[PDB]
Design a protein around this motif. Structure first.
Motif, PDB file in Angstrom:
ATOM      1  N   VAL A   1      14.193 -43.569  40.041  1.00 21.76           N
ATOM      2  CA  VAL A   1      13.974 -43.021  38.706  1.00 21.76           C
ATOM      3  C   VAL A   1      13.675 -44.158  37.738  1.00 21.76           C
ATOM      4  O   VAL A   1      13.946 -45.325  38.013  1.00 21.76           O
TER       5      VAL A   1
ATOM      6  N   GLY B   1      13.285 -45.263  33.311  1.00 17.97           N
ATOM      7  CA  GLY B   1      13.541 -44.970  31.913  1.00 17.97           C
ATOM      8  C   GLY B   1      13.069 -46.127  31.062  1.00 17.97           C
ATOM      9  O   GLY B   1      12.805 -47.221  31.566  1.00 17.97           O
TER      10      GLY B   1
ATOM     11  N   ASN C   1      18.452 -43.035  29.666  1.00 16.25           N
ATOM     12  CA  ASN C   1      17.277 -42.197  29.882  1.00 16.25           C
ATOM     13  C   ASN C   1      16.918 -42.114  31.359  1.00 16.25           C
ATOM     14  O   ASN C   1      16.512 -41.053  31.847  1.00 16.25           O
TER      15      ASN C   1
ATOM     16  N   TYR D   1      19.150 -39.632  32.830  1.00 15.99           N
ATOM     17  CA  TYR D   1      18.791 -38.273  32.435  1.00 15.99           C
ATOM     18  C   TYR D   1      17.580 -37.772  33.209  1.00 15.99           C
ATOM     19  O   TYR D   1      17.485 -36.579  33.520  1.00 15.99           O
ATOM     20  N   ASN D   2      16.642 -38.662  33.526  1.00 13.74           N
ATOM     21  CA  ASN D   2      15.403 -38.245  34.175  1.00 13.74           C
ATOM     22  C   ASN D   2      15.588 -37.801  35.620  1.00 13.74           C
ATOM     23  O   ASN D   2      14.593 -37.455  36.263  1.00 13.74           O
TER      24      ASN D   2
ATOM     25  N   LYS E   1      14.272 -34.188  36.018  1.00 13.20           N
ATOM     26  CA  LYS E   1      12.860 -33.881  35.850  1.00 13.20           C
ATOM     27  C   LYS E   1      12.059 -33.958  37.142  1.00 13.20           C
ATOM     28  O   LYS E   1      10.862 -33.656  37.123  1.00 13.20           O
TER      29      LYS E   1
END
Ligand SMILES: [Mg+2]
Ligand SMILES: [Mg+2]
Ligand SMILES: [Mg+2]
Ligand SMILES: [Mg+2]
Ligand SMILES: [Mg+2]
Ligand SMILES: [Mg+2]
Ligand SMILES: [Mg+2]
Ligand SMILES: [Mg+2]
Ligand SMILES: [Mg+2]
Ligand SMILES: [Zn+2]
Lengths: 36, 146, 92, 229
Positions: free
Chosen positions: D144, D146, D202, D205-206, D209
């Motif tokens: 991931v 961010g 971030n 959090y991603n 997605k």
RNA sequence: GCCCGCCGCCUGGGGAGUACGGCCGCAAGGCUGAAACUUAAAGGAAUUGGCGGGGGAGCACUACAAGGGGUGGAGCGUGCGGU
RNA sequence: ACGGCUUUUCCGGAGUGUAAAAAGCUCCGGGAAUAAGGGCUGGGCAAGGCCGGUGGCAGCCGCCGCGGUAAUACCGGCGGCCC
């Protein structure tokens, strides 16, 4: 001469145009002595 | 500016040429390959050197510091050049006499140069007449031949 | 009150060259380009035409020296009464 | 755990809700932490988190990431202000990050802790490393990314027992969320602590997605929220 | 902005677009272009203030304008610098 | 501070070892006896807001920075940290 646009900024120095003129005056004298 | 080039499968020669061409703009690479330091080094690539003291001097610290730093002029045995060497310690200058022999090494500043508030001095004294200077400053030992 | 010792002698300030450098005529006939030590440079202002103590450098003791002490007007008068300085030396 | 049950019970009885979600929590129509996410609610009362996630008040579940003092210039001198960056979590599946300002350090710390609770999020965990396929929620399930300011952060799955191969700010933030092993890569100015922390937040959090299939959940052992043994 | 190509250029600030060498030009000049040494920043976008022989609004007899009375010249009372 | 124990290591012997020796190894007698230093101590970076000197002097300082008579940063004492 080559371009250095950073030199044209006026903070803490004299104007680039007249520095160029002074250098060109200096280079004339060396050339004359070289021909002698 | 478009995409980085060349990317073709059969464009190896141009890519290698480009990388070689722009590597000369790296100052570290240029000095190593052309051996620029060895050409101007008074110590000739050695880590330490031996010399003879000519005179004592004092150098003023740079602004905004104040004080006098005690140094000596040293003539090198191996090639005859003259350099300036700093004498570390409190009152260490009193153990140096003219015509003594000393061992000097680098002072340890950035990029192998000077340090602190005394630019222009690149070396420091380590031994005096084959005796460690640090001992003499601390005691524990006496300077030979008076 | 202090007096010159050894190579020290009396001198008269002649000209200020800037950058902590002074011109001093000595009591023997040599003009010396003297340097102001930092210990006394930060405390006492010195003007042109004052009596000072000149110590020659250990190397080339003919043109370079240092200024180690300056006298005051009362001290100048005291030295004049004692008989160590003369009017000719003050006037050069 | 026994302390926090009675702590939540004590908080619940003497609390007067002011918002709709607070009323829902007070009346017992919402009983689990996972039910306040993914439906567009606004969270404005810190007591909701205190009731539903009481363990974020433990001293070991809070971290003061940084403290700084900043200056405003006036004709009567310099006015000083404190900025505090802090984070909270339950070490299982939920984490929050916050910033507070104040005239003195204590006020700023209190406000920073308070805002961290309101910014709480839930993440996904798993195991997706090529050299460790264990189906246990000890790392991120996949790579991931961010970013914030000039800082870019990439998180890569790691083998079990490797440790957290990342700067200290990332170490603290990842530890508060319940992650033990990771690899990382960064670009930009990491010495700006606020942007570094926000970029890591971030990136965490991603994880929500990335599209996934039911097979992948079995394959990587993906867990959303609490591990629930 | 996301992707598929090719060429040109950059690698902390100065020394320096300088020195030496070469080509071009009647000349003035053009293109190419280092090192010794020196330095801890140089540089960019934005914030709060202070300032302007920048703009706008307001105010004051320790500001002006319209007025009344003076001080600065002399001797003396008293305070200050100097001697 | 009392009472007890062991002998890697140390001292003196026998065997074995070795081309010959020396080390090494197995036994016997004595005995806690024979054995700790180097760097650092303001931040980066673990460790003192203690005492006495010096007073922009002497000095420290990889970098940022200390020292101007009330120095946690220089010199020394006593503490402490790392290996
Ligand atoms: Mg530019
Ligand atoms: Mg104001
Ligand atoms: Mg942005
Ligand atoms: Mg030419
Ligand atoms: Mg007035
Ligand atoms: Mg008027
Ligand atoms: Mg009058
Ligand atoms: Mg100490
Ligand atoms: Mg510490
Ligand atoms: Zn795993």
């Amino acid at each position: 001469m080559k371009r250095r646009p950073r030199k044209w900024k006026k903070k803490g120095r004299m104007r680039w145009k007249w520095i160029k003129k002074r250098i060109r005056r200096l280079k004339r004298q060396r050339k004359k002595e070289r021909g002698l | 500016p478009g995409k980085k080039a060349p990317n073709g499968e059969f464009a190896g020669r141009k890519l290698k040429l480009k990388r070689k061409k722009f590597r000369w703009s790296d100052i570290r690479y240029k000095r190593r390959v052309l051996r620029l330091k060895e050409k101007s080094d008074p110590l000739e690539g050695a880590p330490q050197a031996r010399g003879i003291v000519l005179e004592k001097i004092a150098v003023e610290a740079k602004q905004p510091n104040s004080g006098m730093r005690k140094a000596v002029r040293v003539q090198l045995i191996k090639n005859g050049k003259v350099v300036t060497a700093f004498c570390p310690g409190d009152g260490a200058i009193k153990f140096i006499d003219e015509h003594d022999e000393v061992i000097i090494e680098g002072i340890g500043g950035p990029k192998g140069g000077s340090m602190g508030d005394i630019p222009g001095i690149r070396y420091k004294v380590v031994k005096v007449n084959r005796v460690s200077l640090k001992e003499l400053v601390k005691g524990r030992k006496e300077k030979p031949r008076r | 009150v202090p007096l010159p010792e050894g190579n020290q002698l009396f001198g008269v300030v002649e000209q200020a060259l800037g950058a902590g450098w002074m011109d001093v005529r000595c009591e023997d006939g040599k003009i010396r380009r003297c340097r102001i030590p930092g210990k006394l440079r930060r405390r006492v202002w010195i003007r042109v035409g004052d009596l000072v103590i000149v110590q020659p450098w250990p190397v080339q003791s003919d043109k370079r020296g240092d200024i180690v002490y300056r006298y005051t007007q009362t001290q100048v008068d005291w030295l004049l009464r004692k008989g160590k300085i003369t009017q000719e030396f003050l006037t050069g | 755990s026994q302390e926090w049950k009675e702590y939540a019970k004590r908080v619940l009885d003497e609390w007067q809700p002011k918002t709709k979600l607070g009323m829902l929590v007070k009346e017992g129509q919402i009983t689990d932490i996972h039910e306040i996410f993914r439906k567009g609610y606004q969270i404005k009362e810190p007591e909701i988190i205190d009731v539903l996630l009481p363990e974020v008040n433990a001293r070991e579940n809070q971290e003061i990431l940084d403290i700084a003092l900043t200056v405003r210039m006036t004709d009567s001198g310099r006015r000083v202000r404190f900025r505090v960056l802090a984070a909270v979590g339950n070490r299982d599946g939920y984490v929050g990050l916050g910033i507070g300002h104040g005239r003195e350090v204590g006020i700023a710390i209190r406000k920073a802790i308070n805002y961290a609770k309101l910014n709480i999020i839930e993440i996904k965990r798993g195991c997706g490393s090529w050299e460790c396929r264990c189906r246990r929620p000890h790392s991120v399930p996949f790579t991931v990314e961010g970013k914030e300011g000039s800082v870019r952060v990439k998180l890569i799955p790691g083998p079990r027992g490797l440790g957290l191969v990342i700067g200290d700010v990332g170490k603290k933030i990842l530890r508060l969320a319940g992650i033990q092993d990771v690899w990382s890569q960064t670009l930009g100015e990491t010495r700006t602590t606020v942007n570094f922390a926000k970029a890591v937040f971030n990136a965490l959090y991603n994880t929500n997605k990335v599209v996934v299939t039911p097979e992948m959940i079995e394959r990587y052992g993906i867990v959303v929220g609490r591990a629930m043994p």
